[PDB]
Amino acid sequence: GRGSIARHQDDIAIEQSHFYVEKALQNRRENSEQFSTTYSFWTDAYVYLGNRVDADWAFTKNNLGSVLYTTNGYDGVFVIDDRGTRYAMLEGELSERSLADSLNADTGDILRSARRAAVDEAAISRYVDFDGAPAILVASAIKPTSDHAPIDLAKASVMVFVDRLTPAKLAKLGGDYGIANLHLLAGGAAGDKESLALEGTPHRLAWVSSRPGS
Amino acid sequence: GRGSIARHQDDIAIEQSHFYVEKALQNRRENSEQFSTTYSFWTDAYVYLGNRVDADWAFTKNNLGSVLYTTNGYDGVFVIDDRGTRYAMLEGELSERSLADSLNADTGDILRSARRAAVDEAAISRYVDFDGAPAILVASAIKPTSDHAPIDLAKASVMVFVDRLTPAKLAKLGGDYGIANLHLLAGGAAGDKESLALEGTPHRLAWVSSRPGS
Numbered sequence: 001g002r003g004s005i006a007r008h009q010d011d012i013a014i015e016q017s018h019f020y021v022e023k024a025l026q027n028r029r030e031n032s033e034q035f036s037t038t039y040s041f042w043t044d045a046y047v048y049l050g051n052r053v054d055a056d057w058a059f060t061k062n063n064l065g066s067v068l069y070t071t072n073g074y075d076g077v078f079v080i081d082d083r084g085t086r087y088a089m090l091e092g093e094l095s096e097r098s099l100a101d102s103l104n105a106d107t108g109d110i111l112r113s114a115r116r117a118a119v120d121e122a123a124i125s126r127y128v129d130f131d132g133a134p135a136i137l138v139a140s141a142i143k144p145t146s147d148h149a150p151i152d153l154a155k156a157s158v159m160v161f162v163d164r165l166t167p168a169k170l171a172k173l174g175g176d177y178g179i180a181n182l183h184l185l186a187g188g189a190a191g192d193k194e195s196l197a198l199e200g201t202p203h204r205l206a207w208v209s210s211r212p213g214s
Numbered sequence: 215g216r217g218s219i220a221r222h223q224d225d226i227a228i229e230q231s232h233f234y235v236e237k238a239l240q241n242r243r244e245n246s247e248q249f250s251t252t253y254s255f256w257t258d259a260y261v262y263l264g265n266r267v268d269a270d271w272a273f274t275k276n277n278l279g280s281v282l283y284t285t286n287g288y289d290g291v292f293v294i295d296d297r298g299t300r301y302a303m304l305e306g307e308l309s310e311r312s313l314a315d316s317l318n319a320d321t322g323d324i325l326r327s328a329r330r331a332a333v334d335e336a337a338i339s340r341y342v343d344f345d346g347a348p349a350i351l352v353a354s355a356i357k358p359t360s361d362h363a364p365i366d367l368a369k370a371s372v373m374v375f376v377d378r379l380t381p382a383k384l385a386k387l388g389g390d391y392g393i394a395n396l397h398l399l400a401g402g403a404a405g406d407k408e409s410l411a412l413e414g415t416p417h418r419l420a421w422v423s424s425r426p427g428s
Contacts, residue, residue, distance in 0.1 A: 009223075012425065012428060015427070015428055016230075016392075016425070016426065016427040016428055019392055019427035019428065020234075020392065020427055023390060023391065023392065023427075026390075027241070027390055031245055034285070034286065035252070037285070038249075038252065038286075041281070042277075043275065043276070043277075044258070044277075060361060061257065061359070061361055062257070062359035062360065062361055063256075063257075063258075065359070067255070067359070071248070071251070071335065072248065072252075121285065145275070145276035145277075145279070145281070146276065147274060147275055147276055176237060176241060177237065178230075178233055178234070178237065211226065211230070212230065212427075213229075213230040213233035213234055213237070213426065214226060214229060214230060214233070
């Protein structure tokens with residue numbers, strides 16, 4: 001036997017808490033990537049949101065409309081292409097504010113990455129500063145299903161879902177994963193709290209280290 | 215202060231393991247409930263599946279087709295109404311086997327429960343024995359969105375999604391939540407393993423007692 005390594009119970013609790021905050025975020029992102037490909041790998045979406053955007057089909061007829069906010073919690077829903085933002089829904093209402101104006105991240109990178117990932121039937125996800133708030137962004141190319149003739153993914157439009165990590169959403173997420181008082185770290189010092197970075201943003205999530213799930 | 219209560223470290227680990235398995239299941243169920251209403255609260259779905267089921271639209275045109283299995287992992291996708299099963303897709307292929315023949319649970323109960331929940335814009339979920347295997351079932355009424363004229367939900371058809379808890383899905387779910395060797399309990403005794411019941415089924419989930427995550 002090499003011998004055991006005994007650990008401080010607080011160190012174990014802190015390690016578990018970081019593990020479960022990371023898993024909460026990863027699981028949220030993977031669920032949202034699946035949601036995005038559900039809405040974007042869809043022949044109807046390719047017809048009505050590829051090329052010219054039919055806001056009547058998307059918003060008035062509720063095919064990509066306010067429910068995505070009032071039920072699914074996507075504070076931002078966008079269709080973008082090489083010219084920029086072609087459709088914008090902010091908090092369930094039509095908006096003229098472009099995705100690029102709302103984000104710290106480069107939207108051309110989002111467009112290109114979503115186009116490439118669509119080759120593997122995949123979406124992309126990342127963290128962003130959405131108008132000064134932490135958010136998870138997911139994006140996937142708008143393409144028809146396999147019964148349709150093939151298209152060139154290099155020119156496909158891209159659907160974007162922006163999930164702002166509000167105090168209420170963070171508190172529910174923390175409860176979902178047994179984390180005590182998950183919140184956006186206010187100042188620059190965590191002090192008594194543990195914290196992690198939402199990489200690609202200046203935001204950090206912080207929480208009180210207690211025995212998680214107890 | 216009342217004074218502290220010190221606990222056995224293995225007892226804490228066991229309590230945390232039960233907490234995170236229960237959260238793993240609840241979060242999976244809530245996600246599938248959202249997925250179900252994404253597909254069922256949909257005017258096109260009401261048109262092509264609400265009464266007579268158009269399998270060309272659903273399967274050939276991939277609006278409710280094989281991707282729901284090959285990407286989203288739903289081993290069973292059904293449309294049911296007062297007459298029984300109107301549409302059945304098993305492992306991504308059209309099937310003649312009814313939902314009622316596949317379940318231990320009563321499908322009239324599912325129809326009624328979903329038709330009611332739709333009044334509150336909700337789906338329903340439960341655990342089932344799906345042809346001898348543990349599964350999560352979710353169901354929601356097929357109804358158009360609010361721009362459409364009102365319909366009678368009491369006569370609406372119901373979409374049903376069946377997520378079979380295969381060994382691969384269970385191992386991945388367990389890893390998602392820091393659980394060691396999550397599996398379908400083989401025999402009748404867990405012995406050294408922890409277990410919980412999938413209520414409404416004879417199935418139990420079992421796992422090896424470890425410090426979760428860590």
